Amino acid sequence: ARTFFVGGNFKLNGSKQSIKEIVERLNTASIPENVEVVICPPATYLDYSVSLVKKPQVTVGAQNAYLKASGAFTGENSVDQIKDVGAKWVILGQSERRSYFHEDDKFIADKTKFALGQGVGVILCIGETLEEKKAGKTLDVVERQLNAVLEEVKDWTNVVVAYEPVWAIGTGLAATPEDAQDIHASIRKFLASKLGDKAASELRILYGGSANGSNAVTFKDKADVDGFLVGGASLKPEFVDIINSRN
Amino acid sequence: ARTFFVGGNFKLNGSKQSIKEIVERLNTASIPENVEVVICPPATYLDYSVSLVKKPQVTVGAQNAYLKASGAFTGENSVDQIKDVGAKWVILGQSERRSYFHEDDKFIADKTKFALGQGVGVILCIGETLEEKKAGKTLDVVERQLNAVLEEVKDWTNVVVAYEPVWAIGTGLAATPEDAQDIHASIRKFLASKLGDKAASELRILYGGSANGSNAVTFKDKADVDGFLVGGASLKPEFVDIINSRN
Numbered sequence A, B: 001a002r003t004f005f006v007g008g009n010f011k012l013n014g015s016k017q018s019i020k021e022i023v024e025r026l027n028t029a030s031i032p033e034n035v036e037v038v039i040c041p042p043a044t045y046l047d048y049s050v051s052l053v054k055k056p057q058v059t060v061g062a063q064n065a066y067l068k069a070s071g072a073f074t075g076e077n078s079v080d081q082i083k084d085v086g087a088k089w090v091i092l093g094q095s096e097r098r099s100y101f102h103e104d105d106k107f108i109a110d111k112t113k114f115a116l117g118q119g120v121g122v123i124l125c126i127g128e129t130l131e132e133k134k135a136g137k138t139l140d141v142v143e144r145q146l147n148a149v150l151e152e153v154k155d156w157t158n159v160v161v162a163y164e165p166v167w168a169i170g171t172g173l174a175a176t177p178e179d180a181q182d183i184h185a186s187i188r189k190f191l192a193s194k195l196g197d198k199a200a201s202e203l204r205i206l207y208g209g210s211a212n213g214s215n216a217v218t219f220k221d222k223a224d225v226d227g228f229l230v231g232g233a234s235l236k237p238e239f240v241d242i243i244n245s246r247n
Helices: A016-028 A043-052 A079-085 A105-117 A130-134 A138-152 A177-195 A197-202 A239-243 B016-028 B043-052 B079-085 B105-117 B130-135 B138-152 B177-202 B238-243
Strands: A005-009 A036-040 A058-062 A089-092 A121-126 A159-163 A204-208 A227-230 B004-009 B035-040 B058-062 B089-092 B121-126 B159-163 B204-207 B227-230
Touching: A005 A089, A005 A159, A005 A204, A005 A239, A016 A036, A016 A043, A016 A058, A016 A239, A036 A089, A043 A058, A043 A079, A043 B043, A043 B079, A079 B043, A089 A105, A105 A121, A105 A138, A121 A138, A130 A138, A138 A177, A159 A177, A177 A197, A177 A204, A227 A239, B004 B089, B004 B159, B004 B204, B004 B238, B016 B035, B016 B043, B016 B058, B016 B238, B035 B089, B035 B121, B043 B058, B043 B079, B089 B105, B105 B121, B105 B138, B121 B138, B130 B138, B138 B177, B159 B177, B177 B204, B227 B238
Parallel strands: A005 A036, A005 A227, A036 A058, A058 A089, A089 A121, A121 A159, A159 A204, A204 A227, B004 B035, B004 B227, B035 B058, B058 B089, B089 B121, B121 B159, B159 B204, B204 B227
Antiparallel strands: none
16 A cells, blocks of 8 residues: 655754764664665765665655755755755754744745755655644645645655654654644545545655654554654654564 | 965755866866865765865865754754865855745854854855845845944855845846946945955955856956856856966
């Protein structure tokens, strides 16, 4: 049906030694032939991380890039440059970009149609902050985020959606598998009625936010929870345990 | 006296073969000893550029970084990972960053304090738009931008300032050798106000705004123009002509 995807966002972490030891353990882990693993390092180690990977199921992605591949856009990342180096994914739209780094939904929307225009796969994130949660505004916000992408992008084959309760981001208190299933399935029938039942049925919807070694098995029999976006334990050994969580 | 300095801000531009092509031209061309050349590629290509650099004057620097070193800040570059890959400089303030990406002056200041503290040199940019230019806001804008820094950073030994007349950067006109001289000299004495004659006497102010092979020699017997922050011509081969403009 859909393939189980485990994305590992490293974040502003990782040195050449630590990238050596993480992608060394992934080449040594015993994972299913039938699993999709994307490690997303800081751009300063993407080229290195692709030198190091020797397991076919693990491709490498960047964590942010800009919506034009060349020019005077100092400080920025480019899809063409990460692609040259051999990476196949870019995370667009993290709780650590939109809040702090002032990324407006249209900014992510336009960014997401140029990336797919360029061959790369996108990891798109959507998420409500605890007050939007306190006021029963979760779906109302997620649809608002998705709809800006939706007004721009119409083939979402190489798109994955990453739902991140902002209040579960690397706090240690995740959603329960049950709470997460409801919203995932809600996002999918919203995305059925906006894209088709076939495309809504192919799209992967990753849960993100305090996902870790021991709680991944509780999300084991959750149909609309197609994988995981692992931030904090992406740089821990229990990362293979979240990749073998349905194994 | 002040050492000649030539910074090469590549912006969002390059590929492995281009950065290979470019570093080899400097790796073998005639360049004065005691000139200071810093090439600033995209973050993806920083590690490789350092493996490629062989001519000692030439160090690599990153085009932008955050005010923290590790953590939850997706898409950001870290002062330590640039150091890890071996770049010795970070362009900050630079000017773009203020316009499209909205970096306020104090964001820059704090990022300069932390950056120097981390032991990485700062190329610091300053400048006014055509709207502060025709209004006659020029000097009080730069004094505000520099004052912001000045309150945080109280040692300026590994700082080079860059004045990008924003009415020139990528527009394709270089505001004269004469009014350039006068803006640098103005801002050298404002710094001397805030750090004494001593500090100001050794600090470098580089003219940014369209500098190139054909014209870098008309900035030659200009005293306060201590170097250049080349954008576009860094890619091109006249970048070598600009390291020899001052003979």
